[PDB]
């Protein structure tokens, strides 16, 4: 009965994201992994690609649902009947931005609670941006990505 | 079903704590507000006082239980069959210490998840320490405390 | 006789800016709200639009003067006979950047003092960028903008 | 016309404090350098010593007044008819605590504005605590102190 | 026998960079100042220009070698037989990013040690970006750049 | 040839310290692990205990020398003919204090360079203080300590 949304750009989904969504499914009955189209960020992968990659990478988790969206995130939460919004916290920089976003989301949807999870030590220093930057210079990022995502990233960069 | 602990010194409990525990009760079935018995620095209020004040200030929340404890937070969570540890996040100093505690707690009790909540803007700058310091120097702290705590703090400082 | 400048991009001016400039006029005899053309930031509103919006939003403050500029900000301060440069401080990120800018400005104009004000709790989490991002997704930002600015933002996004 | 207070422990006053108060005197008509009487941690110098040292070190500034006080900072500002409270900002730890104090002071005395000034690069890493710690361990701190304070600190440490 | 690499975009090299590389040559036998082509950052100066500017600005240091590169930085370190990677640390923002990069580099090349140096007070607030921004508005940046670099920057902006 | 000091309280030495000193020995010819004799806060272990524990835990490193000292760090470095002072960096709180210490040490001993190293992800959240606090509250800290220190800490806490 408790529904949570885990929103992000997931360009592409990393093992840090897999850790966060896994921890969310151990707390809440149903977790919506919500992939924002994010045209302003000029993503490497299309929304359809990101959704497909995330679906395969989370297929082993029975209470996850992957959906793409372009809406205001508070409206999308309401429309999914979610009362929790999950964010992962890595460093001070995101923490300050996440605090601003959480105050804005509270204004837009007061009954949506933002809950923050801290990453595992293994993934505390990675981001999609850092992984792409390493891969673009032909550095090994197999440790940081689900197998299907790593294959897709190698293929994208080969073109 | 889902059991969460909200540990702290609560010396005394403030409206920032009430905000956090209220948010936790809207997320989880049962919330244990856990008051540490023997703080490193001699608290202004005794454990018995802190428990009584917190019980009165949370009596309106049906799924809160106020309990004193003298153990390691993770040992207490384990014995209470809690799978969520609630922490409030106010500033950067908070975030960095909390990250260290969360990594340590994951080592001590892997089946315990640390969840971080953000206070309302109204309470994001207060702490029990700041309220006590202002009150001891004859400043107005009525806005930041439950009525019963306001009364108890005035009585303490009058002697 | 004490003249202060409050510089920024003001794209568009928000209620956080209104709070800062209002507080500045309670401290200093004359405040110049100085709007930088900022072509490098590709602003949503033209400089003329930003100046007009800020003029209307501050018309109730008798000792404010709104001016657009493209100059080095230390030169513009000197040319306005200002000895104080006002900046609002929201989080750690701007604080560090503001410290760098203040040291550079001190090098360029040693007699120009940078003074920093802290925002009201109400506006401590907003920025022009965040308001635009919410509005672009059709979220309600009426609370955060002067009425004339909100109308102009809705109209801009309608085209 | 404009009255400002610059409160602190000044145990002892350093060249960083002299820098801040000098900058304040170039901004405001009258600056009260306000020395707290009963610090939480037993100061190295008595209140009478700290006041005498600060008076000598600021005697060349015609619009500074050095005063001891034992009250809440806002209560003292109010009774001194000050409308500006001066704080120096050095690092991130400074900024976060100062933000909390400023929000509290706005609650306690809405007609008091908190103004933050930045030290010269020369003094941005010093504090009375660091200077005392270096001096007690037989390090050279002459550069960081007014001559009279250097003399008084050497005498204190010799006994 | 101890070889260190000091990588960066150096667009253009500043006196802060000169300070760091000078300190590195006092610690290590041979220092490679490694200039990344950095097309993603759309540099003002071409790689060949940046290399030539850095060579002239470090010609007085006998154990510095300036080289341009487009490789993964861990691979370039290995190929230069370097076991130390030098980074300068200015503020909290770079510190957090540098920590992420250092953890990634440790994954890619475990025997490459990242060592961080703190800048002189004189250069603690400057960056290539800030210097370019000031120069683009015709502000004086002679204090912050080697003579040859300042001439080249003035000439670039004159076109 | 190159002599470095690694100063600290080491109360007790942890695996984070072992990591840092091991990294330092791979960079410099001789590393002095320097244990401060009279900490500001009464250490859990006496100086003789801390030195013996650190000697045993570093006996496998051929170019480490464990020495107690009661002086200013810079005075000790100078007398040991060290030109490098090693510090470990864990978080933002670490970074800001270390920046202040490094600027002061450059004032006290210009020929001493401060070098900052980053701990493995495995140890980036631990400190002697956190380990002691967990152990005194009956938590498992075996993973974070050399075996000899684990034994000594258990014995200390048993009495
Ligand atoms: C309060 C607030 C601020 C910015 C927002 N952007 C959106 N929608 C798009 C979106 C959601 C996510 C996640 N990523 N992206 C690009 N909703 C917002 N809500
Ligand atoms: C990981 C960790 C670190 C310190 C700890 N202290 C405790 N218990 C005592 C305690 C808890 C609170 C709240 N206050 N006090 C005094 N448990 C801990 N767990
Ligand atoms: C020391 C320094 C650094 C950057 C500068 N940019 C300018 N002028 C343009 C400007 C001013 C403001 C406000 N916004 N913008 C875009 N003056 C500068 N001064
Ligand atoms: C909001 C706030 C918080 C703490 C306060 N302490 C005081 N007065 C005592 C004081 C001032 C200084 C400087 N040092 N000392 C000991 N006024 C306060 N106001
Ligand atoms: C771990 C990691 C992350 C990003 C990387 N980018 C590169 N090569 C290009 C590069 C090196 C420098 C310095 N600047 N630039 C643009 N190597 C990387 N290694
Ligand atoms: C610049 C500076 C600041 C404080 C200092 N304290 C010392 N020596 C005493 C000391 C060193 C360590 C480690 N622990 N303890 C107690 N040297 C210092 N240098």
Coordinates of N, CA and C in Angstrom, one line a residue, chain B residues 1-151:
Chain B
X1 N 3.7 -3.5 10.7 CA 4.6 -4.1 9.7 C 6.0 -3.5 9.7
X2 N 6.1 -2.3 9.2 CA 7.4 -1.6 9.1 C 7.7 -0.9 10.4
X3 N 8.8 -1.2 11.1 CA 9.2 -0.6 12.4 C 10.4 0.3 12.2
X4 N 10.3 1.6 12.6 CA 11.4 2.5 12.5 C 11.8 3.1 13.9
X5 N 13.1 3.4 14.1 CA 13.5 4.0 15.3 C 14.0 5.4 14.9
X6 N 13.8 6.4 15.8 CA 14.2 7.8 15.6 C 15.0 8.1 16.9
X7 N 16.3 7.9 16.8 CA 17.1 8.1 18.1 C 17.7 9.5 18.2
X8 N 17.9 9.8 19.4 CA 18.5 11.2 19.7 C 18.7 11.4 21.2
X9 N 19.2 12.6 21.5 CA 19.3 13.0 22.9 C 18.1 13.7 23.4
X10 N 17.4 14.5 22.5 CA 16.1 15.2 22.8 C 16.2 15.9 24.1
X11 N 17.2 16.8 24.2 CA 17.5 17.5 25.5 C 17.4 19.0 25.3
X12 N 16.1 19.6 25.2 CA 14.8 18.9 25.2 C 14.3 18.7 23.8
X13 N 13.2 17.9 23.6 CA 12.6 17.8 22.3 C 12.1 19.1 21.9
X14 N 12.3 19.5 20.6 CA 11.9 20.7 20.0 C 10.9 20.5 18.9
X15 N 10.3 21.6 18.4 CA 9.4 21.5 17.3 C 10.0 20.9 16.0
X16 N 11.3 21.0 15.8 CA 12.0 20.3 14.8 C 11.9 18.8 14.9
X17 N 12.1 18.3 16.1 CA 12.0 16.9 16.4 C 10.5 16.4 16.1
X18 N 9.5 17.2 16.6 CA 8.1 16.9 16.4 C 7.8 16.8 14.9
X19 N 8.4 17.7 14.1 CA 8.2 17.7 12.7 C 8.7 16.4 12.1
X20 N 10.0 16.0 12.5 CA 10.6 14.8 11.9 C 9.8 13.6 12.3
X21 N 9.4 13.4 13.6 CA 8.7 12.2 14.0 C 7.3 12.2 13.4
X22 N 6.7 13.3 13.2 CA 5.4 13.3 12.6 C 5.5 12.8 11.2
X23 N 6.5 13.3 10.4 CA 6.7 12.8 9.1 C 7.0 11.3 9.1
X24 N 7.8 10.9 10.0 CA 8.1 9.4 10.1 C 6.8 8.6 10.3
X25 N 5.9 9.1 11.1 CA 4.7 8.3 11.4 C 3.7 8.3 10.2
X26 N 3.9 9.2 9.3 CA 3.1 9.1 8.0 C 3.7 8.2 7.0
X27 N 4.9 7.7 7.3 CA 5.6 6.8 6.4 C 5.6 5.4 6.8
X28 N 5.8 5.1 8.1 CA 6.0 3.8 8.7 C 4.9 3.5 9.7
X29 N 4.7 2.2 9.9 CA 3.6 1.7 10.8 C 3.8 2.1 12.2
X30 N 5.0 1.9 12.7 CA 5.4 2.1 14.1 C 6.7 2.8 14.2
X31 N 6.8 3.9 14.9 CA 8.0 4.7 15.1 C 8.3 4.7 16.6
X32 N 9.5 4.3 16.9 CA 10.0 4.4 18.3 C 10.9 5.6 18.4
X33 N 10.5 6.6 19.2 CA 11.3 7.7 19.5 C 12.2 7.3 20.6
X34 N 13.5 7.2 20.4 CA 14.4 6.5 21.2 C 15.3 7.6 21.8
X35 N 15.3 7.7 23.2 CA 16.0 8.8 23.9 C 17.2 8.2 24.6
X36 N 18.4 8.6 24.2 CA 19.7 8.1 24.8 C 19.8 8.5 26.2
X37 N 20.1 7.4 27.1 CA 20.1 7.6 28.5 C 21.3 8.4 29.1
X38 N 22.5 8.1 28.6 CA 23.7 8.7 29.2 C 24.5 9.4 28.1
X39 N 24.1 10.7 27.8 CA 24.8 11.4 26.8 C 26.3 11.7 27.2
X40 N 27.1 11.9 26.2 CA 28.5 12.2 26.4 C 28.7 13.5 27.2
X41 N 27.9 14.5 26.9 CA 27.9 15.7 27.7 C 26.6 15.7 28.5
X42 N 26.8 16.0 29.8 CA 25.7 16.0 30.8 C 24.5 16.8 30.3
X43 N 23.4 16.1 30.0 CA 22.2 16.9 29.5 C 21.6 17.8 30.5
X44 N 20.9 18.8 30.0 CA 20.2 19.8 30.9 C 19.1 19.1 31.6
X45 N 18.3 18.2 30.9 CA 17.2 17.5 31.5 C 17.6 16.0 31.7
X46 N 17.2 15.4 32.8 CA 17.5 14.0 33.1 C 16.7 13.2 32.1
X47 N 17.2 11.9 32.0 CA 16.5 11.0 31.1 C 15.0 10.9 31.5
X48 N 14.6 10.8 32.7 CA 13.2 10.7 33.1 C 12.5 12.0 32.6
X49 N 13.1 13.2 32.7 CA 12.4 14.4 32.3 C 12.3 14.4 30.8
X50 N 13.3 14.0 30.0 CA 13.3 14.0 28.6 C 12.3 13.1 28.1
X51 N 12.1 11.9 28.7 CA 11.1 10.9 28.2 C 9.7 11.5 28.5
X52 N 9.5 12.0 29.7 CA 8.2 12.5 30.0 C 7.8 13.7 29.1
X53 N 8.7 14.6 28.8 CA 8.4 15.7 27.9 C 8.1 15.2 26.5
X54 N 8.9 14.3 26.0 CA 8.6 13.8 24.7 C 7.3 13.0 24.6
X55 N 7.0 12.2 25.6 CA 5.7 11.5 25.6 C 4.5 12.4 25.5
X56 N 4.6 13.5 26.4 CA 3.5 14.5 26.3 C 3.4 15.2 25.0
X57 N 4.6 15.5 24.4 CA 4.6 16.3 23.2 C 4.2 15.4 22.0
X58 N 4.3 14.1 22.1 CA 3.9 13.2 21.0 C 2.6 12.4 21.3
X59 N 2.0 12.6 22.4 CA 0.8 11.9 22.8 C -0.3 11.8 21.7
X60 N -0.4 12.9 20.8 CA -1.4 13.0 19.8 C -1.1 12.1 18.6
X61 N 0.1 11.4 18.5 CA 0.5 10.6 17.4 C 0.3 9.1 17.9
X62 N -0.6 8.4 17.2 CA -1.0 7.1 17.7 C 0.0 6.0 17.6
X63 N 0.9 6.2 16.6 CA 1.9 5.1 16.3 C 3.3 5.5 16.7
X64 N 3.5 6.4 17.7 CA 4.8 6.7 18.2 C 4.9 6.0 19.6
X65 N 6.1 5.5 19.9 CA 6.4 5.0 21.2 C 7.7 5.6 21.7
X66 N 7.7 6.3 22.8 CA 8.9 6.9 23.4 C 9.5 5.9 24.4
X67 N 10.8 5.6 24.1 CA 11.6 4.6 24.9 C 13.0 5.2 25.2
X68 N 13.5 5.1 26.4 CA 14.8 5.3 26.7 C 15.7 4.1 26.4
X69 N 17.0 4.4 26.1 CA 17.9 3.4 25.8 C 19.3 3.8 26.1
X70 N 20.2 2.9 26.5 CA 21.5 3.2 26.8 C 22.6 2.4 26.0
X71 N 22.2 1.8 24.9 CA 22.9 0.9 24.1 C 23.4 1.6 22.9
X72 N 24.3 0.9 22.1 CA 24.5 1.3 20.7 C 23.2 1.4 19.9
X73 N 23.1 2.4 19.1 CA 21.9 2.6 18.3 C 21.5 1.4 17.5
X74 N 22.5 0.7 16.9 CA 22.2 -0.4 16.1 C 21.8 -1.6 16.9
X75 N 22.4 -1.8 18.1 CA 22.0 -2.9 19.0 C 20.6 -2.7 19.4
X76 N 20.2 -1.4 19.7 CA 18.8 -1.1 20.1 C 17.8 -1.4 19.0
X77 N 18.1 -0.9 17.8 CA 17.3 -1.2 16.6 C 17.1 -2.7 16.4
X78 N 18.2 -3.4 16.5 CA 18.1 -4.9 16.3 C 17.1 -5.5 17.3
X79 N 17.3 -5.1 18.6 CA 16.4 -5.7 19.6 C 15.0 -5.3 19.5
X80 N 14.8 -4.1 18.9 CA 13.4 -3.6 18.7 C 12.8 -4.1 17.4
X81 N 13.5 -4.9 16.7 CA 13.0 -5.4 15.4 C 12.7 -4.2 14.4
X82 N 13.5 -3.2 14.5 CA 13.4 -2.1 13.6 C 14.2 -2.3 12.4
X83 N 13.7 -2.0 11.2 CA 14.5 -2.1 10.0 C 14.8 -0.7 9.4
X84 N 14.3 0.4 10.0 CA 14.6 1.7 9.5 C 15.1 2.6 10.7
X85 N 16.2 3.3 10.5 CA 16.7 4.3 11.4 C 16.5 5.7 10.8
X86 N 15.7 6.5 11.4 CA 15.3 7.9 11.0 C 16.3 8.9 11.5
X87 N 16.9 9.7 10.6 CA 17.7 10.8 11.0 C 17.2 12.1 10.3
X88 N 17.3 13.2 11.0 CA 16.9 14.5 10.4 C 18.2 15.1 9.9
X89 N 18.1 15.8 8.7 CA 19.2 16.5 8.1 C 19.0 18.0 8.0
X90 N 19.8 18.8 8.6 CA 19.7 20.2 8.7 C 20.7 21.0 7.8
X91 N 22.0 20.7 7.9 CA 23.0 21.4 7.3 C 24.1 20.5 6.8
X92 N 25.2 21.1 6.3 CA 26.3 20.3 5.8 C 27.0 19.5 6.9
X93 N 27.2 20.2 8.0 CA 27.8 19.5 9.2 C 27.0 18.3 9.5
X94 N 25.7 18.4 9.5 CA 24.8 17.3 9.7 C 25.1 16.2 8.8
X95 N 25.1 16.5 7.5 CA 25.2 15.5 6.4 C 26.5 14.7 6.5
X96 N 27.6 15.4 6.8 CA 28.9 14.6 6.8 C 29.0 13.7 8.0
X97 N 28.6 14.1 9.2 CA 28.6 13.2 10.3 C 27.6 12.1 10.1
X98 N 26.4 12.4 9.5 CA 25.4 11.4 9.3 C 25.9 10.3 8.3
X99 N 26.7 10.8 7.3 CA 27.2 9.8 6.3 C 28.1 8.8 7.0
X100 N 29.0 9.3 7.9 CA 29.9 8.5 8.6 C 29.1 7.5 9.5
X101 N 28.1 8.0 10.2 CA 27.3 7.1 11.1 C 26.6 6.1 10.3
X102 N 26.1 6.5 9.1 CA 25.3 5.5 8.3 C 26.2 4.4 7.7
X103 N 27.4 4.8 7.3 CA 28.3 3.7 6.9 C 28.7 2.8 8.0
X104 N 28.9 3.3 9.2 CA 29.2 2.5 10.3 C 28.0 1.6 10.7
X105 N 26.8 2.2 10.7 CA 25.6 1.4 11.1 C 25.4 0.3 10.0
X106 N 25.7 0.5 8.8 CA 25.5 -0.5 7.8 C 26.5 -1.7 8.1
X107 N 27.7 -1.3 8.5 CA 28.6 -2.4 9.0 C 28.1 -3.1 10.2
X108 N 27.5 -2.4 11.1 CA 27.1 -3.1 12.4 C 25.8 -3.8 12.2
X109 N 24.9 -3.4 11.4 CA 23.6 -4.0 11.2 C 23.1 -3.8 9.7
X110 N 23.6 -4.7 8.9 CA 23.3 -4.6 7.4 C 21.8 -4.5 7.1
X111 N 21.0 -5.1 7.9 CA 19.6 -5.2 7.7 C 18.8 -3.9 8.2
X112 N 19.5 -3.0 8.7 CA 19.0 -1.7 9.1 C 19.3 -0.6 8.0
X113 N 18.2 0.0 7.5 CA 18.4 1.1 6.5 C 18.3 2.4 7.2
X114 N 19.2 3.3 6.9 CA 19.2 4.7 7.4 C 18.4 5.6 6.4
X115 N 17.4 6.3 6.9 CA 16.5 7.1 6.1 C 16.7 8.6 6.6
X116 N 16.9 9.5 5.7 CA 17.1 10.9 6.1 C 15.9 11.7 5.7
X117 N 15.4 12.5 6.6 CA 14.3 13.4 6.3 C 14.7 14.8 6.6
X118 N 14.0 15.7 5.8 CA 14.4 17.1 5.9 C 13.3 17.9 6.7
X119 N 13.8 18.8 7.6 CA 12.8 19.5 8.4 C 12.2 20.6 7.6
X120 N 11.0 21.0 8.0 CA 10.4 22.2 7.5 C 11.3 23.4 7.5
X121 N 11.1 24.3 6.6 CA 11.9 25.5 6.6 C 11.8 26.2 8.0
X122 N 10.7 26.1 8.6 CA 10.4 26.7 9.9 C 11.4 26.3 10.9
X123 N 11.9 25.1 10.9 CA 12.7 24.5 11.9 C 14.1 24.2 11.4
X124 N 14.5 24.6 10.2 CA 15.8 24.0 9.7 C 17.0 24.7 10.3
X125 N 16.9 25.7 11.1 CA 18.0 26.3 11.8 C 18.1 26.1 13.3
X126 N 17.1 25.3 13.8 CA 17.2 25.2 15.3 C 17.7 23.8 15.7
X127 N 18.2 23.8 16.9 CA 18.7 22.6 17.6 C 18.4 22.8 19.0
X128 N 18.4 21.7 19.8 CA 18.2 21.8 21.2 C 19.3 22.7 21.8
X129 N 20.6 22.5 21.3 CA 21.7 23.3 21.8 C 21.4 24.8 21.6
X130 N 21.0 25.2 20.4 CA 20.8 26.6 20.2 C 19.6 27.2 21.0
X131 N 18.5 26.4 21.1 CA 17.4 26.8 21.9 C 17.8 27.0 23.4
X132 N 18.6 26.1 23.9 CA 19.0 26.2 25.3 C 19.9 27.4 25.5
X133 N 20.8 27.7 24.6 CA 21.8 28.8 24.7 C 21.0 30.1 24.6
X134 N 20.0 30.2 23.7 CA 19.2 31.5 23.7 C 18.4 31.6 24.9
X135 N 17.8 30.6 25.4 CA 16.9 30.7 26.6 C 17.8 31.0 27.8
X136 N 18.9 30.4 28.0 CA 19.8 30.7 29.2 C 20.2 32.1 29.2
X137 N 20.4 32.8 28.0 CA 20.7 34.2 27.9 C 19.5 35.1 27.8
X138 N 18.3 34.6 28.2 CA 17.1 35.4 28.4 C 16.5 35.8 27.0
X139 N 16.6 34.9 26.0 CA 15.9 35.1 24.8 C 14.6 34.3 24.7
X140 N 13.7 34.8 23.8 CA 12.4 34.1 23.6 C 12.6 32.9 22.7
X141 N 12.3 31.7 23.2 CA 12.3 30.5 22.4 C 10.9 29.8 22.3
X142 N 9.9 30.5 22.8 CA 8.5 29.9 22.8 C 8.1 29.3 21.5
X143 N 8.4 29.9 20.4 CA 8.0 29.5 19.1 C 8.6 28.1 18.7
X144 N 9.7 27.7 19.3 CA 10.4 26.5 18.8 C 10.2 25.3 19.6
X145 N 9.3 25.4 20.7 CA 9.1 24.3 21.6 C 7.7 23.9 21.8
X146 N 7.4 22.7 22.1 CA 6.0 22.3 22.5 C 5.8 23.1 23.8
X147 N 4.5 23.4 24.1 CA 4.1 24.1 25.3 C 4.7 23.5 26.6
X148 N 4.6 22.2 26.7 CA 5.0 21.5 27.9 C 6.5 21.7 28.1
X149 N 7.3 21.6 27.0 CA 8.7 21.8 27.0 C 9.1 23.2 27.4
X150 N 8.3 24.2 26.8 CA 8.5 25.6 27.1 C 8.4 25.8 28.6
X151 N 7.3 25.3 29.2 CA 7.1 25.4 30.7 C 8.3 24.7 31.5

